[PDB]
Subunit: 599 residues, 3 copies
């Protein structure tokens, strides 16, 4: 019985105390230790070499203890390790082995979940240094790494990056790198107070699947001018996405460098999230250099039902090439988003846009293969002073994009800067159901609402419909002479255009093309013959050889005659129609006409 009291006080004591669930005689006869062994916490490993528990705190490095817990649970085929509530667990050194090549702190392992209820906080050892807090690669070379499967991080807890700035722009910092990750997720966690490159990365160059970020918060994760670039979540495996998250930045630097999400492989999504204070909402890009695991096509890309205040662009599309692989982006949907450019001076952040068709990372605009994109049922607003705001900034080659039933209230509808890139554009479709707002009315001196600064446009539709007047704009739509236009439909509805000097402008007379279909208002001077009765009226100018029909948009103030209601043309480029002289006489009128070609 000495050994009994001794047994009981020893670490095997619980293993000698019997238990049977709820005194049920049909239940297993267990020992207390068996029941305790059903759960596991950091406290079961956070101990000195003699086994005595250590309290966490700013003067204690918890890293080795958490790694020991992960390693052991892994050896039993997995489980969930709780990081207890009511404590802050500090990390204060780098991990070792395969994660060292990633500046890793903790190595995640398959089937080992982390239930973070307390706080995890970086110690000042990491100030001005690279780091990746949680790393799922098991090799410094990602190509030589094994997979991470079935690893979920969740809870009501917090990862706090300590506020430390980057030491050099070339450094990288991350919260969770799942690695070559299959069925991994982060749910519920707040990531805050840092200067980092990413908070979470999913996948590696297309290897991975079914990775998700849900109900997480990301708060103040850029804080310095050193930080080169930031994307809060980088989605680099298929069948993965981000939903119902909150993203907020307060620093000036974030308004110039930070993006919330990057979707970089097929079957990926960004849904139901709120963004504030960022430069950009989401990249949707196929990088040829990332094509190894899931092919060279990014398809089935969804950005839906988000709420955003940003300073640059909401969605940025891209694809590129390497020496041996060509990336392609197609089958994209952008719907249900409500987006605004936050209050800022014109030109004070990257050019404001709902959609950007951006060049590659070396600035090339002639490598892209972007098509089959639907942008529908979104709202976009930019304040009236923001000259640099567009529904779409179309800066690189575009093989198709369709806009239906959006409401865009900003300076430009379609824009690209003159003198810059000259994109080749195919299959740009702007349906009449896009509503153009009035916030920027009166602000558009010298500007074209649709400024078509492209090398060429083919197979495209622009149906312009105003909903209020803006007589400040130079034109509704302008094509420079350098832009070829063919097999396209361009229309300007007459409503709110009566007083406009120019409506559609074709500086190379491109509307004359055999397969150009256009209509727009114009003012035309006519003169009739003197005959009483049915009598022809003819335009005094001769630049209408392309017109197939025209009709009156003006009332007739006269009693003694009427000009024609409708007109066609003649070989010399005059318009002609048949009016009526109740009394004879040569007549001379100025009329507003709808000019039509093949429509």
């Amino acid at each position: 019985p000495d050994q009994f009291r001794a047994i009981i006080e020893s670490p095997e004591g619980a293993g000698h105390v019997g238990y049977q669930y709820r005194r049920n005689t049909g239940s297993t006869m267990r020992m207390v230790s068996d029941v305790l062994d059903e759960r596991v916490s950091l406290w079961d490993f956070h101990c000195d070499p003699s086994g005595n528990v250590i309290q966490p705190g700013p003067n204690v490095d918890s890293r080795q203890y958490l790694q020991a817990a992960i390693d052991y649970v892994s050896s039993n085929g997995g489980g969930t390790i709780t990081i207890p509530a009511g404590y802050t667990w500090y990390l204060g050194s780098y991990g070792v082995g395969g994660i060292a090549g990633h500046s890793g702190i903790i190595q995640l392992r398959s089937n080992v979940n982390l239930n973070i209820e307390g706080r995890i906080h970086l110690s000042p050892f990491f100030d001005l240094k690279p780091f990746q807090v949680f790393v799922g690669f098991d090799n410094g070379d990602p190509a030589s790494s094994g997979n991470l499967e079935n690893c979920h991080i969740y809870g009501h807890g917090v990862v706090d990056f300590g506020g430390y700035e980057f030491g050099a722009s070339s450094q990288l910092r991350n919260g969770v790198a799942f690695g070559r990750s299959y069925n991994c997720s982060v749910t519920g966690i707040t990531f805050q107070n840092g200067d980092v490159t990413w908070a979470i990365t999913l996948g590696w160059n297309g290897y991975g699947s079914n990775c998700y970020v849900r109900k997480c918060r990301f708060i103040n994760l850029v804080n310095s001018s050193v930080n080169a670039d930031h994307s809060t979540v980088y989605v680099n495996c298929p069948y993965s996405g981000v939903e119902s998250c909150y993203f907020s930045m307060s620093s000036s630097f974030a308004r110039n460098i930070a993006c919330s999400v990057a979707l970089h492989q097929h079957d990926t999504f960004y849904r139901g999230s709120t963004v504030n204070g960022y430069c950009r909402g989401a990249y949707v890009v196929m990088h040829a250099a990332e094509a190894a695991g899931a092919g060279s096509y990014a398809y089935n890309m969804q950005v839906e039902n988000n709420i955003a205040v940003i300073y640059g662009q909401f969605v940025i599309l891209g694809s590129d090439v390497t020496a041996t692989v060509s990336g392609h982006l197609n089958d994209v949907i952008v719907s249900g988003n409500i987006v605004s450019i936050g209050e800022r001076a014109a030109f004070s952040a990257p050019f404001g846009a709902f959609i950007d068709i951006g060049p590659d990372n070396s600035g090339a605009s002639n490598v892209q293969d972007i098509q089959r994109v639907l942008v529908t049922g979104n709202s976009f607003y930019a304040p009236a002073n923001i000259t640099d705001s567009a529904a779409i900034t179309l800066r690189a080659n575009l093989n198709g994009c369709t806009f239906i039933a959006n409401n865009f209230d900003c300076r430009y509808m379609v824009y690209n800067a003159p003198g810059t890139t000259s994109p080749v554009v195919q299959n740009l479709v702007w349906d009449k159901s896009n509503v153009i707002g009035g916030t920027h009315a009166n602000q558009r001196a010298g500007q074209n609402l649709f400024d078509m600064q492209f090398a060429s446009v083919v197979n495209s539709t622009i149906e312009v419909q105003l909903s209020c007047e803006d007589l400040s704009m130079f034109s509704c739509i302008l094509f420079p002479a350098s832009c070829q236009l063919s097999y396209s439909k361009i229309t300007v509805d007459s409503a709110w255009t009566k007083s406009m000097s120019n409506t559609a402008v074709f500086e190379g007379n491109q509307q004359a093309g055999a397969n150009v279909y256009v209509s727009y208002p114009a003012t035309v001077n006519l003169t009739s013959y003197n005959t009483q009765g049915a009598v022809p009226f003819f335009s005094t100018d001769t630049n209408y050889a392309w017109v197939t029909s025209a009709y009156s948009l003006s009332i007739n103030e006269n009693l003694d005659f009427s000009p024609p209601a409708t007109y066609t043309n003649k070989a010399n480029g005059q318009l002609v129609g048949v009016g009526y002289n109740e009394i004879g006489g040569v007549r001379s009128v100025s009329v507003r006409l709808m000019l039509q070609r093949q429509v």
Copy 2:
């Protein structure tokens, strides 16, 4: 060894029994009590003064015990208290201190989560009395209250309000008032069986952030005529919302008073939820009196992808003023919802509507600043007998609202009651892509589909497109003489209109305005001169001085002549065009024309 058996049976016994996780010699040498101390339940506090456990039941008030648990866990920096499954925990008295000013029962505290697995039920002490079950304010004056942070209530359990009716209409009742709440949430909980004002309130007058209601059920929470008003969730802090919830009412009273959600600050949302039996779906409102914590603008407001059967209005917009603050509502999106007015007699509940632009709480219609709203891709249905159903009831001043690509199948498209308010309307946009259903065909004697009972309309677009005949309606669109109309576009497509006596009606001849752009069908009597050959035809009536062109919508049954295909006007208000007399003779025809002005 006497003291050893004694120690073991004492409440410190577990603190003497050793344990080491899974017999791992690298694990902490702990005591059983340390492992048990990692969790906490109501059972750890639900005890008499001698420490003996008390069983819950209808004759036991569990309030003080649950408060003791919350208070203690709070003192250790937080955690999660389980409310065990398999029991009903009754509450039977008011709390004390700061929550007493709120009729509070339990005080929530920061970082203390409640995992409700069992049932919490109100005892009859609360019958006919006010109460707020869970309160996160710490002061009777909300202005003087501290914050509630990091408080989550979740589980598979239930809050049951006991079925008790209100005692007086002036009383207030609530389930969860998070208070000045930051990162708080309710997930998974069923709230049922009550007569209450709210189930959950988030925030206080704009103070709070990141508060959410997810996957909760709200069932039968209004049951009496005493109940003054009900909104199941009131969202009164930014960056907060409701998603994937279920709301159901069965009482008659709920069909007249209850709303599912109120969104009252910026960056708030209501998504993916199902409603049945309610008067209203969601208020979206900026009250100047609520502007203290987050400014006087409600912007980035999202109502998306909900399913509803309601008896009144789906979304209600509003903003108002106090003596020193002016509220503004802008940047709203309503998309993807499928909504119907449930089976009821006409006029038996508040006027049916998809969108309502409602007056302030004192009935004023001249204080609102509502603009930049997008309503797109929704469906609305009301049964054919429901005279009082509209796509939009526009009852107060409106500074903009845009409708694109909806399907509305109800009695009216645009409505406001004559003789009532006379709203000032700007920037109302009804795109042609809105599909008008046929359920109410033949029901519209004496009614105008678009009944424009406003003081004035400016910068507005109404493109009417029918998809079946309804010859019962008096007109497609009518403007009384009291409504000014300027800088607007009004069109009536001809399809299904051939037999209509009136299509567009302008009782003050407002279509003549300099910047009014309109087109609609009309029947016109013409008579020609007798000349053989090209010969003029002229209208017999003189009310066409505003017409810029017209064209035939009718076949010509004649062989010996043809009327003009197109017409323009003359100063006296006749139409004129040039037809053709194969044989001479004065001709007299009645023709269906499309009348156009500036289009």
Copy 3:
């Protein structure tokens, strides 16, 4: 003290060791066994008759132990049973009693939740046999069954069906049958590796409510030619749905037989999910034979924001009748989905379609009552070789369907096979805002883009708008002479049509109907009189008696004359207009005209 050591080692030992939470003197004086009794796992029942624990494994049938755990927890009013992580629990025999009529393995019980953290795996006893793993019916006759309430299955674990093929096509296999289920759910679970009929079924013939499938994965659940049919989730109770799930198949058989979801009662939804490798996305159907619990109407049906690669049809609509009940489907929304037909040969799987209006299970096309459906803001793509691809295959009677603001890029827009069914169509609305893609340009020899192979069409709108040329197609829209057409609007925009031989084709001259409203381009030969001055031009053909107006789509290459800009008709079916001869002479021209009737 002998009995004390004995007590302590006995199964009542923990019941003698005292504990008080965190040494708090205000806490309950408990015993260790009380605290352990707050949780329950499979280990508490997975024991031999002497109470000794049994290890799970491929040679152990865990079924009776799990049932014992469920039965006991049920007797205490519920709770959550954990299925521990780090182990595979095999099932190797059928259950007994009420579930035997369902081939049941485990019986679920009300208020008893399963937290599946480990793996559950079927033993080879089930090879070639029927089975339903988890069954919530309590009677072999579902009509005589009690309800299952408040039963949630959740966790990070897995249900593995062992890879076994069906033994006979008449067998049924299921993962979870909740039965007559109220407030039940499955969250987080992976179902994999099987040949089954369903993974999860919710409800029974309309009995049930508030059942949900969320964040689950379904992987490779069809593997043989024996498998008759598969729907991964069958939703057979109202106020229930599927959200944020992943569905994947790899077998050839799945491309011909498998559907992801079946929505079969009102107020049901399918949202935010990703599908790959399936034949079909979702059925949306009211079967009269399923109408018992919730009525004969399926209404408030939502399919939104999904991502899919399928081989057959995305959404399939249906309703049918029994001898005494008639099923109805109305108030449906399909929005925000991005869908493609995967790479396959033409005709190698069921006919590709976004929407299918399908016959009943006996092939009848004359029993359906389907109306008030909105399809808006979706994208659909099929590769160019897939002849059998359509936006809508309209194969049974249709009482209404509305398409607004979609982007469809496939072979046909509207299709039904000639010689097959002859549907009666009412209220088909194809708005102009639907964008028709160009992938299948040049592939359409002998084909009509809109192939209207119906018995009749009434109250319908087809506004065709091309966005690129396809001169291979025989026509944009064709109506055989067998299809009646009335009270409808059919338009073909002229853009990209100049070179088309046929645009709209009415093989029975149906465009002449009194209430048919149509416009489309045509080429017409005209000849004038010889008179100098205003001079008539007349068509040489006489098939224009239905034309109310026409206008020029062609330039005039002549200086000495001009044909009319606009035309009307004469009784003999010629067109006539007034042109102008500067010099006299008989003129003869061929002109492209927009032919209009009542528009």
